[PDB]
């Protein structure tokens, strides 16, 4: 019953998601400077293609605050395939259980917006 608070970054290229130190955290006016830390989780979807065979769709990366989402128990910097970490300078390395996850039944997803001067890899 839980989803990301933001819309996804679609991976159109061959390279995985990666942000330079300090960049990557989506803008949220309902959050404070201490909360600006989390991870992007890759979600690949498979569909029945025009030839009957299963084919992959462009991967989607969803942001979740630290201590929240499908990898709530993972600490910052944890090595896991499909998980990349982001944190703004000044955010505290503590769980963000007060923000948590979004319930789509009563909350719309916030359009993913990166701060001014955020660099994204090719195909994003």
Author numbering: 48 to 171
Original authors' sentences:
One central protein involved in the formation of regulatory ribonucleoprotein complexes (RNP) is the coronaviral structural protein nucleocapsid (N). N plays a major role in RNA genome replication, translation, and packaging and has further been found to interfere with host-integrated stress responses and stress granule formation. The N-NTD possesses a peculiar, hand-like three-dimensional fold, with a β-sheet palm and several flexible loops, arranged as fingers around the central β-sheet. The latter, together with the extraordinarily long basic β-hairpin finger, constitutes the positively charged primary RNA-binding surface.
